[PDB]
Amino acid sequence: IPVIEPLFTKVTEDIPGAEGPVFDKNGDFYIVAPEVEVNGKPAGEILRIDLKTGKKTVICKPEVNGYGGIPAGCQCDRDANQLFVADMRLGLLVVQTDGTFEEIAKKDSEGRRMQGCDDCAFDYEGNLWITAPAGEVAPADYTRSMQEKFGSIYCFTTDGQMIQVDTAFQFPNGIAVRHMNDGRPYQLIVAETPTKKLWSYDIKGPAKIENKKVWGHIPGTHEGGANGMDFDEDNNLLVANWGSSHIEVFGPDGGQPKMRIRCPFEKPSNLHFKPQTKTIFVTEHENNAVWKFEWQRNGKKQYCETLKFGIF
Ligand SMILES: [Ca+2]
Ligand SMILES: [Ca+2]
Structure with a gap:
């Protein structure tokens, strides 16, 4: 399995549990800091990063009824410059660029308590697919499915x-949606961290998946495994292999990595492409920093890069 060593450039640092890198419609860059605490209690933050200077600005410190959040994953919205944020303590949040936020739901369609979320991914139809490795959201006691199998999607x-x-x-973690050339959602890919497996489902429609299958295998015996992921324009899946010092690259068909990217840190956590470029921004937990490197091709367009009123 070939391994490449691209040049990694530091962007910023000192961001506890650096996760969820994302770009909004205007090209602004954001990341979340889920491990920031205050007196032993969660006080996670959502930050905007000035790419020119690397200067940080906390735009939101989510808290619901005295319960702080643990924001971990983000997705940009198309129909408005707002971010959807997976929070391990608060569930699903919608955050405005001015810092105002709102909790999306405390219970699902079946009326059961919402679980803490980790990452999410929009399909081109506007449906948001979310992984939920934590137990019930606040005010329930915080738990995570690292050992027990109670994580949901x-x-x-x-x-x-x-x-x-x-x-x-x-512990379902990273998640991505594979689209057909016609732009139709085809497959849902879900990372299950400790088991070193990537699972896939066939998407038949909104909230309709079937044919669960082991889609890929994550290398290593290390503690950890697949965390965040994203597709490039050719539908290759890049996966942060937390604890392995590598970002695995899978072909459209899955299976075993077609190649690996060696990182100058042991814990890559998530990644994201800068729109219209080959630039990938990577968050990592060794130094709690954000880095960037050049991929071999542009990233797959995110939902908020698509046009609602586009003819072609
Ligand atoms: Ca994650
Ligand atoms: Ca991403």
Whole structure:
């Protein structure tokens, strides 16, 4: 398995548990700091990073009824410059660029308590697919499915429904949607961290998946495994292999990595492409920093890069 060593450039640092790198519609860059604490209690932050200077600005410190959040993953919205944020303590949040936020739901479509979320991914139809490795959201005691299999997967539909699509995962983490050339959602890819497995489902429609299958295998015996992921324009899946010092690259068909990217740090956590470029921004937990490197090609367009009123 070939391994490349691209040049990594430091962007900024000192961001506890650096995660969820994302770009909004205007090209602004954001990341979350889920491990920031205050007196032993969660006080995670959402930050905007000035790429020119690397200077940080906390735009939001989510808290609901005295319960601080643990924001971990983000997705940019198309129909408005707002961010959807997976929070391990608060569930799903919608955050405005001015710092105002709102909790999306405390219960799913079946009326059961919402679980803490980790990452999310929009399909081109506007449906948001979410991984939920934590137990019930605040005020319930914080728990995570690292050992027990109670992690779930949700789909937040365009018509505002929060539907659990599956469960029994041992820490579902990264998640990505594979689209057909016609732009139709084809497959859902879900990372299950400790098991070193990538799972796939066939997407038949909103909140409708079937044919669960082991899609890929993550290398290493190390503690950890697949964390965040994203597709490049050719549908190659880049996966942060937390604890391995590498970012695995899978071909459209899955299986074993077609190649690996060696990182100058042991714990890559998540990644994201800068729109219209080959630039990938990577968050990592060794130094709690954000880095960037050049990929061999542009990233797959994110949902908020698509046009609602586009002819072609
Ligand atoms: Ca994650
Ligand atoms: Ca990403």
